[PDB]
């Protein structure tokens, strides 16, 4: 299948590497256009894939069977909208990122729009990406109008195992957002690894109560307790890790907060729910960003 990968960072390079290993015809698509993109990936078994692939070829884009998007959340929608008039109108666009709120920015996309999450882990080490862990990628329809693109799950399963189609992708994204709304800003603010959060059960529950209330109003069934339990399982499995938001903070990079607690606050406002803890986290992180930027 012919694929354009938008965003040639850790995840994009993972997918590019994996797609080439199965013989799919690919290109990259970069922010700062160049004719080629550098893929340097170390697989879980130590094998090395170092390759220069086509990038930013608009004719290639115009005849792609899939636009795979692996940008950070705040990068996604402007970059997609700018390619959308080139991409065939029948060609699916698959978004894989953390956070939510990009789909709301992409309501007028005429292409089929698919949302994805993944538990694979890929980490930048200089100009090398390392595939740290294998995992599971779920994809589904981004919007109410988006139809059955399960065939893509079947293809991508053979590229980067495991991939599954989920019609209820949105509910899954909301649960992952709950976890993200706890772990990312608290670790960012406290400058601590994820496991330190277990010494704050009350604050964790409070955030979980706010998010559960938004989730219920959105039509997905969950409870504060269930969200809390899922948070603790993620903290337990990542206790020693530095969160992606804390990494951003420490590297003086823009964070995904407008698509994590920020999104949660936009949906809270639209259902008139008060979310004072989430608000504090969002504002605290925005202030930390303004200390650089
Ligand atoms: N990496 C993982 O293990 C992992 C796992 C699960 C989910 N995710 C999620 O996947 C998303 C991407 O993560 P990542 O780790 O791959 O991020 P990353 O390494 O920062 O990759 C993003 C790439 O897209 C580029 N970019 C920004 N704006 C662009 C534009 N307009 N056009 C083209 N390229 C543009 C970046 O280049 P510049 O930095 O030069 O702008 C970068 O190379 C995030 O939401 C993350 O939370 C990541």
UniProtKB/Swiss-Prot annotation:
Catalyzes the NADPH-dependent reduction of ketopantoate into pantoic acid. It is found in: Cytoplasm. The gene is panE. This is 2-dehydropantoate 2-reductase. The active site is at 176 (proton donor). Keywords: Cytoplasm, NADP, Oxidoreductase, Pantothenate biosynthesis. It catalyses: (R)-pantoate + NADP(+) = 2-dehydropantoate + NADPH + H(+). Disulfide bonds: none annotated. NADP(+) binds at residues 7-12, 31, 98, 122, 256. It comes from Escherichia coli (strain K12).
